[PDB]
Amino acid sequence: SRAAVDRIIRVDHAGEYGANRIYAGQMAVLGRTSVGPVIQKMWDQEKDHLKKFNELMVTFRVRPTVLMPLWNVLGFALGAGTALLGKEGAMACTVAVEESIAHHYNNQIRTLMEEDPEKYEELLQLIKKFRDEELEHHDIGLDHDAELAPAYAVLKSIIQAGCRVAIYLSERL
Amino acid sequence: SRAAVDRIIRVDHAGEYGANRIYAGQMAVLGRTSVGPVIQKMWDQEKDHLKKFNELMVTFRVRPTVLMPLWNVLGFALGAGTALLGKEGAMACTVAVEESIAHHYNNQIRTLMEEDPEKYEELLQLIKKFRDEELEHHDIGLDHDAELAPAYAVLKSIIQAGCRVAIYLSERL
Amino acid sequence: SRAAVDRIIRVDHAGEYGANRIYAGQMAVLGRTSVGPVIQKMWDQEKDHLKKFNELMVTFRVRPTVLMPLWNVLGFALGAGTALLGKEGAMACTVAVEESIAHHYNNQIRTLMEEDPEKYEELLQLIKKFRDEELEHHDIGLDHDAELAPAYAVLKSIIQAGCRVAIYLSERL
Amino acid sequence: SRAAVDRIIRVDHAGEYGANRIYAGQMAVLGRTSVGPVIQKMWDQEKDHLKKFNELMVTFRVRPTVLMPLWNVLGFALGAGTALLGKEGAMACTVAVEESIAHHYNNQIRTLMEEDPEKYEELLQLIKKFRDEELEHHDIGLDHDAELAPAYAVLKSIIQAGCRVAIYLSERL
Amino acid sequence: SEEQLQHRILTAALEFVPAHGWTAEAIAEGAQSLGLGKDGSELILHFVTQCNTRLTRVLEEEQKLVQLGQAEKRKTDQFLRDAVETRLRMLIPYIEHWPRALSILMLPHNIPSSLSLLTSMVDDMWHYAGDQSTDFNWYTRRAMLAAIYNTTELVMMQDSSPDFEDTWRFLENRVNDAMNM
Amino acid sequence: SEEQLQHRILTAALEFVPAHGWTAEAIAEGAQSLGLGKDGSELILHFVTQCNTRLTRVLEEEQKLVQLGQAEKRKTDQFLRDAVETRLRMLIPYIEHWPRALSILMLPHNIPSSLSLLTSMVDDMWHYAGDQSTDFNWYTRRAMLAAIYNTTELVMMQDSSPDFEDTWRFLENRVNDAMNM
Amino acid sequence: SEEQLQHRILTAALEFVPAHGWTAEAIAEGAQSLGLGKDGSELILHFVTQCNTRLTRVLEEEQKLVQLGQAEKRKTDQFLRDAVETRLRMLIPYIEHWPRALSILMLPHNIPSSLSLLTSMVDDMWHYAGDQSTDFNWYTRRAMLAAIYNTTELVMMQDSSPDFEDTWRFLENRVNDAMNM
Amino acid sequence: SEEQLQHRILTAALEFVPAHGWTAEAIAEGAQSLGLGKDGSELILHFVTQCNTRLTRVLEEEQKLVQLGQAEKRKTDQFLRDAVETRLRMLIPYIEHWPRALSILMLPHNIPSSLSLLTSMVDDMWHYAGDQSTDFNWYTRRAMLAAIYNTTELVMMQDSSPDFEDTWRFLENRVNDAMNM
């Protein structure tokens, strides 16, 4: 089923590309502060995720999403718009992005197991490893289970909702 | 120019209708708390504004916006969604709505004067009086110039941006 | 897989409903001409198809398409817009509708066989019988293989293209 | 009022650009037939109209429509799609395009006169001259008042309706 | 301006439409009595626009009679049946060529013009019937009356009963079935 | 199994929600009685799904009793009032912490999940009342009952009358005003 | 399945298309040699699909021929000119009736099928030229080659030069002007 | 006029922004010395609007100076680097409080106003650079220059090199890498 694996690879390639643009925007604003090293490590992590999905796109001849120029601008603007609020706004954006990416990885792991674990074994291992890395962030002090302000929890949810819309559009377009 | 006055009356009727639904949603959640009397006064204020614009709709045979059933649900949900966050989330929504309504009143005043102040005498007087009431709120402690949390300022801006989109859609549809 | 059978029943219910509205529009214009009996027999045929799909909607608890009031108006207008051109415009519309309905029946047959012919026994038999009736029309002189004018072949294709868009929208919404 | 002049120049530039693409498509199919010289004269006529509106775009610093790459493809496809039907399909497209362009010229003439004929005198003179040229076509036998087939009159109306949608979109976007 | 004379040209053409139709031949023949496109869209849209203007003058003149006591107020169902019949009786002189005019109005590029004229007509009918809706019932009431008018107009085209008595009976049932919603 | 592990963990956590709330503290404490996110979104959505499944089993059992003669059929207005009250009484043990749970369900990223659960619940209520709608009335009836449920749920949160008698009185007037529409 | 029957019927009909055309007459006449709609869409879409499959095999066989020996890799502009010429030379036996087939492919209800076939063909051409684009250049390159193919196909229909030498000269200038972006 | 009072009040406030910031405290403090919202959006949008107007006058004066032979025309890459540096040097007196002003401009309800001001600025820069695009290159050129300006503005906020020499070096590389596309 090439149509099912192409949709998975295209939307994962688009998600890691948009995450690259968000950390580029955050580094453009908070790059020389005390959270600069933390953002740099986050940005370097997604450069490896995007590099791997580029190889899978070439190997399986997957059509990239037509909305990449849109994610290029919106990702940078969202990353730069936050971190102009401050470090708490930047970290709220980071957690909302990592959780939104890990959320969609879980859905793909579920549907990939229900079809053919033997055939989709190499891809499942990669997605599980990436899904684990989207949640660890303990050596940098970024805990996904932290009591945010009631207003920052709404901001995180709005960002997370927007990423879900982008994920929906990218796997089709 | 009936086409210009009809667009002004239709979008002002829709704005006061949506504000009625927002305070209905807030009263449904925070009606028996200490901010209940404040929300009731706000709700009663917009009932008079909506009553006046109903009379102007009948007098000038203005077509109402086709999106009123949509503003019926979204207004109540936004009002109920806030005030479930708490009193600060409710007041952030209130200020974002009053400022968004007063912002559009100013635009109409500056365009109604440039055409014919003598012809648009009563309409200008009514809009100015309503514009002043959208900003006073001093007897209830609701000051539009107050320091909010950095995240509550973003939430207020997102609500204010959404109201601008609704205003744009209602004067055409 | 109730999600797949509901999608099939909803789009077939919507297609037969729209065909009912088209023949209602044609009967409103050409009901008293010499082609009146032919249109009446076509209209009666789709009343039975729609009656059967109403029973399947009740039995399987299928959500009807939300664009029913839209197909109500567009179907009648398309049927009335043609047959005001004349009898050749009406018959071009009829063939474009019967072929578009039969085309989608074939797609559902080839996807209902690949899953479980034993499970989808009665549904496959009903769809095959209806698809055979969408193409016979020999007792009324309506032959789907007739050399139309080059411009009437374009009009038939435009109508057929529009029905495909409506079929696409109706099975999702 | 540069806002009104910019809309007029942008939508007229887009209309002549789309007409250039349509005759390019027709020449690609019927260029070596007996109607080749007629299509060439039509194509050369719109090259001069487009050249003039390019100069007005540079002079008045008008933003071009963002849909030009879309009109580049749709215009060529529409011109090539017709003239594959035949010479009557090509001429139906030509008349539908010339009438749709001349129709919008008349609307702009009646709005430039109501504002300031003295100020908008040079532009009104050009639009009137172009509007006259969109309707003469007597040296080539192309008469806009000719009894087409009932199906070709519908095809002409569909093309004319589509051009009005493009005109509506281009003056805004 | 020149719009006034073409308005008179179109106005004069209507005297010969029952003999010729809604073509450009009657436009010239109507102008030949004055001494001054071939689709016929402008002639048809002019006739519909002027018939809507005649209707709103008839309705406002009946409103004065009930406000002063010379006439008794009718119920909404009775009022709407009379307004639709009054508007449809303007088509009697041109009843043979009206199906051709309807097809032109139904052409894809004429649809926006025909819809706006029809929307304005049913808006006038509901205003003089006493409608003051500011909610979505504004659209519901006008859409319902637009469908009644269009279906009654189609019945009138193919009606041969004396004085269109089967058309008005059809109109009555449509209005009665709509007031019962 | 694999997914049944968290399902048992989530099921056990509900015994401590009245003391702690819809947070991840009760998720862990519920697991500590069995042995093994932080906002509680997954715990809340699990509870709502289970309550919807309990409701459709209650409606099946009542349907059997009326088709065999052990119970008498109720009118639609009476049936819907009983179905909403039955579903709302499942929130009585958790009545103090439910406003917090509603806040989570109203978060923008949880709205699609909450709407689908609410749509499935009112669809079940209308089915066992004998709806059988295949036109747009399918959407009208379910939207009307969804609004009644949500506004009655808000009244129940701030209600201190004995046995929520003011909530059911509000529900009665809400249903009566809808059957007349 | 019965799909093999129609596939064989459609395959056999292509032997008589140059004598009759893309109508249902050749479908029956082609089937008369085997033993067993009138638009012709199925026959045309089958021929285009099979010609795309033949092109994939030709390009694949040239790829393994260059990875081993007896074949030297050529430039991208040279490769694309050869791939378009190879694909267009499949239309030479049907050159007289192809303008009629293009008209059917351009019908509004056939547009989605024709576009998908054309997109798959230029995707194959760019893959064997070594594209490996994962950004918007994927769409830019394939749109550019699709326009080159379609305009060269139109030039080929009306070309009478020996061995279509004016068509390949047109293709060369097209490709050269596209590599200078 | 009434609006001229706002312009005078906002103009006087800019003298105290480097001491206080883009708040309403400086709006009142600047208004006290000349006359009698708290977000600061009006003050920031006024400053950006006036800085774009100053840039237009500067570019006009350089255009007149080069048409009379008193200055030598330079390349597009050199011209655009000078126009961006000229516009960015207007932020030097307010360099400490500009990150706060950028945050306000990036608020969702201020984005449409900020985009129009930025679009007008790069349109002016390209006009005086000699751009006369009427195709899609109009959007490509202006989007490219808008991206450069915004990224150079962010580098300028966190730059501590003497006379922002590392900001202009960054601007040079961005312009050079863009002229190669």
UniProtKB/Swiss-Prot annotation, chains A, B, C, D:
<protein>
    <recommendedName>
        <fullName>NADPH-dependent 3-demethoxyubiquinone 3-hydroxylase, mitochondrial</fullName>
        <ecNumber>1.14.13.253</ecNumber>
    </recommendedName>
</protein>
<dbReference type="GO" id="GO:0005634">
    <property type="term" value="C:nucleus"/>
</dbReference>
<dbReference type="GO" id="GO:0000122">
    <property type="term" value="P:negative regulation of transcription by RNA polymerase II"/>
</dbReference>
<feature type="binding site">
    <location>
        <position position="134"/>
    </location>
    <ligand>
        <name>Fe cation 2</name>
    </ligand>
</feature>
<keyword id="KW-0158">Chromosome</keyword>
<keyword id="KW-1274">Primary mitochondrial disease</keyword>
<dbReference type="GO" id="GO:0045944">
    <property type="term" value="P:positive regulation of transcription by RNA polymerase II"/>
</dbReference>
<dbReference type="GO" id="GO:0005694">
    <property type="term" value="C:chromosome"/>
</dbReference>
<dbReference type="GO" id="GO:0110142">
    <property type="term" value="C:ubiquinone biosynthesis complex"/>
</dbReference>
<dbReference type="GO" id="GO:0005739">
    <property type="term" value="C:mitochondrion"/>
</dbReference>
<keyword id="KW-0831">Ubiquinone biosynthesis</keyword>
<keyword id="KW-0503">Monooxygenase</keyword>
<dbReference type="GO" id="GO:0005743">
    <property type="term" value="C:mitochondrial inner membrane"/>
</dbReference>
<keyword id="KW-0560">Oxidoreductase</keyword>
<dbReference type="GO" id="GO:0010468">
    <property type="term" value="P:regulation of gene expression"/>
</dbReference>
<feature type="binding site">
    <location>
        <position position="168"/>
    </location>
    <ligand>
        <name>NADH</name>
    </ligand>
</feature>
<feature type="repeat" description="2">
    <location>
        <begin position="86"/>
        <end position="173"/>
    </location>
</feature>
<dbReference type="GO" id="GO:0160224">
    <property type="term" value="F:3-demethoxyubiquinone 3-hydroxylase (NADH) activity"/>
</dbReference>
<feature type="binding site">
    <location>
        <position position="134"/>
    </location>
    <ligand>
        <name>Fe cation 1</name>
    </ligand>
</feature>
<dbReference type="GO" id="GO:0008340">
    <property type="term" value="P:determination of adult lifespan"/>
</dbReference>
<dbReference type="GO" id="GO:2000377">
    <property type="term" value="P:regulation of reactive oxygen species metabolic process"/>
</dbReference>
<dbReference type="GO" id="GO:0031314">
    <property type="term" value="C:extrinsic component of mitochondrial inner membrane"/>
</dbReference>
UniProtKB/Swiss-Prot annotation, chains E, F, G, H:
<comment type="subunit">
    <text>Homodimer. Heterodimer; two heterodimers of COQ7:COQ9 come together on the same side of the lipid pseudo-bilayer and form a curved tetramer with a hydrophobic surface suitable for membrane interaction. These two tetramers assemble into a soluble octamer with a pseudo-bilayer of lipids captured within. Interacts with COQ7; this interaction allows ubiquinone (CoQ) isoprene intermediates presentation to COQ7 and facilitates the COQ7-mediated hydroxylase step.</text>
</comment>
<dbReference type="GO" id="GO:0008047">
    <property type="term" value="F:enzyme activator activity"/>
</dbReference>
<dbReference type="GO" id="GO:0008289">
    <property type="term" value="F:lipid binding"/>
</dbReference>
<comment type="pathway">
    <text>Cofactor biosynthesis; ubiquinone biosynthesis.</text>
</comment>
<feature type="modified residue" description="N6-acetyllysine">
    <location>
        <position position="73"/>
    </location>
</feature>
<comment type="similarity">
    <text>Belongs to the COQ9 family.</text>
</comment>
<dbReference type="GO" id="GO:0042803">
    <property type="term" value="F:protein homodimerization activity"/>
</dbReference>
<feature type="binding site">
    <location>
        <position position="142"/>
    </location>
    <ligand>
        <name>a 1,2-diacylglycero-3-phosphoethanolamine</name>
    </ligand>
</feature>
<keyword id="KW-0832">Ubl conjugation</keyword>
<keyword id="KW-1274">Primary mitochondrial disease</keyword>
<protein>
    <recommendedName>
        <fullName>Ubiquinone biosynthesis protein COQ9, mitochondrial</fullName>
    </recommendedName>
</protein>
<dbReference type="GO" id="GO:0006120">
    <property type="term" value="P:mitochondrial electron transport, NADH to ubiquinone"/>
</dbReference>
<dbReference type="GO" id="GO:0110142">
    <property type="term" value="C:ubiquinone biosynthesis complex"/>
</dbReference>
<keyword id="KW-0446">Lipid-binding</keyword>
<keyword id="KW-0809">Transit peptide</keyword>
<dbReference type="GO" id="GO:0019840">
    <property type="term" value="F:isoprenoid binding"/>
</dbReference>
<comment type="function">
    <text>Membrane-associated protein that warps the membrane surface to access and bind aromatic isoprenes with high specificity, including ubiquinone (CoQ) isoprene intermediates and presents them directly to COQ7, therefore facilitating the COQ7-mediated hydroxylase step. Participates in the biosynthesis of coenzyme Q, also named ubiquinone, an essential lipid-soluble electron transporter for aerobic cellular respiration.</text>
</comment>
<dbReference type="GO" id="GO:0005739">
    <property type="term" value="C:mitochondrion"/>
</dbReference>
<keyword id="KW-0831">Ubiquinone biosynthesis</keyword>
<keyword id="KW-0496">Mitochondrion</keyword>
<dbReference type="GO" id="GO:0005743">
    <property type="term" value="C:mitochondrial inner membrane"/>
</dbReference>
<keyword id="KW-0007">Acetylation</keyword>
